[PDB]
Motif scaffolding. Structure first.
Motif, short mmCIF file in Angstrom:
data_model
loop_
_atom_site.label_atom_id
_atom_site.label_comp_id
_atom_site.label_asym_id
_atom_site.label_seq_id
_atom_site.Cartn_x
_atom_site.Cartn_y
_atom_site.Cartn_z
N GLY A 100 -6.04 1.44 1.11
CA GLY A 100 -6.84 2.13 0.13
C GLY A 100 -6.47 3.58 -0.09
N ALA A 101 -5.52 4.12 0.66
CA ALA A 101 -5.13 5.51 0.50
C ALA A 101 -4.10 5.67 -0.61
N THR A 102 -3.86 6.91 -0.99
CA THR A 102 -2.92 7.23 -2.06
C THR A 102 -1.54 7.43 -1.45
N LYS A 103 -0.55 6.67 -1.92
CA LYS A 103 0.81 6.81 -1.43
C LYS A 103 1.51 8.01 -2.06
N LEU A 104 2.09 8.85 -1.21
CA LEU A 104 2.65 10.13 -1.62
C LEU A 104 4.14 10.24 -1.32
N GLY A 105 4.79 9.15 -0.92
CA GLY A 105 6.23 9.15 -0.76
C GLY A 105 6.67 8.20 0.34
N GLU A 106 7.96 8.31 0.70
CA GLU A 106 8.57 7.56 1.78
C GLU A 106 9.55 8.49 2.47
N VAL A 107 9.62 8.41 3.79
CA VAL A 107 10.62 9.16 4.56
C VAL A 107 11.27 8.20 5.54
N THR A 108 12.56 8.40 5.79
CA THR A 108 13.32 7.61 6.75
C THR A 108 13.55 8.46 7.98
N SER A 109 13.15 7.94 9.13
CA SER A 109 13.32 8.69 10.36
C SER A 109 13.33 7.74 11.55
N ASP A 110 14.19 8.05 12.52
CA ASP A 110 14.17 7.39 13.83
C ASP A 110 14.16 5.87 13.71
N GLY A 111 15.00 5.35 12.82
CA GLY A 111 15.25 3.92 12.74
C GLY A 111 14.35 3.13 11.81
#
Length: 189
Positions: A100-111
């Motif tokens: 139910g939250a608002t998606k504000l992006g994607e980040v790639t980290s640590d696999g």
């Protein structure tokens, strides 16, 4: 076996909170270790780490995490000015806390790829009292109970998306539960 509160144990900050309902056992081990065993609990949060945290800490965690119900395993903390509660969620049980939250992006980290979300808490308890404040979330797609978290990759990705942090307060690896059962044993460094 300890009763809720905060302090220092074997060089690490710890924090253990519960809502009084019972069914939770939290134990501080040697060094960076802590264990949590819970059965038909209420709401609780417990872990070890740092007071204050930093914006470029590489947090390592090793152990086992066996939830039965609603629980999370996270790097968890606060900032002040602005007041922000944040979560880097590595694993969870029956409830994905970004629901139910608002998606504000994607980040790639640590696999893994993480999804980024913002929620708002209105007139809720905080480290400075009842307040209205935002929550920032990074939710790991590929769940795990051991690993290394490069906090700077998340904080920088949040900042790019407009989700700014202030002065760091405590920063722990935390097992959170909401009316569930489970066991966890985690060592932080």
């Amino acid at each position: 076996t300890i009763q809720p509160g905060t302090g220092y144990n074997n060089g690490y900050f710890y924090s253990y909170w519960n809502d009084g309902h019972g069914g939770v056992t939290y134990t501080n081990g040697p060094g960076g270790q802590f264990s949590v065993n819970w059965s038909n609990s209420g709401n609780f949060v417990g872990g070890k780490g740092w007071q204050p945290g930093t914006k470029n800490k590489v947090i390592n965690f090793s152990g086992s995490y066996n939830p039965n119900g609603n629980s999370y395993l996270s790097v968890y903390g606060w900032s002040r000015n602005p007041l922000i509660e944040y979560y880097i969620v590595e694993n969870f049980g029956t409830y994905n806390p970004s629901t139910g939250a608002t998606k504000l992006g994607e980040v790639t980290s640590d696999g893994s790829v993480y999804d980024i979300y913002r929620t708002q808490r209105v007139n809720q308890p905080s480290i400075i009292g009842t307040a209205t404040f935002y929550q920032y979330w990074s939710v790991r797609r590929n769940h795990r109970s051991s690993g290394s978290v490069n906090t700077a990759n998340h904080f920088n990705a949040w900042a790019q998306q407009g989700l700014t942090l202030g002065t760091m307060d405590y920063q722990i690896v935390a097992v959170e539960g909401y009316f569930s059962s489970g066991s966890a044993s985690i060592t932080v460094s």
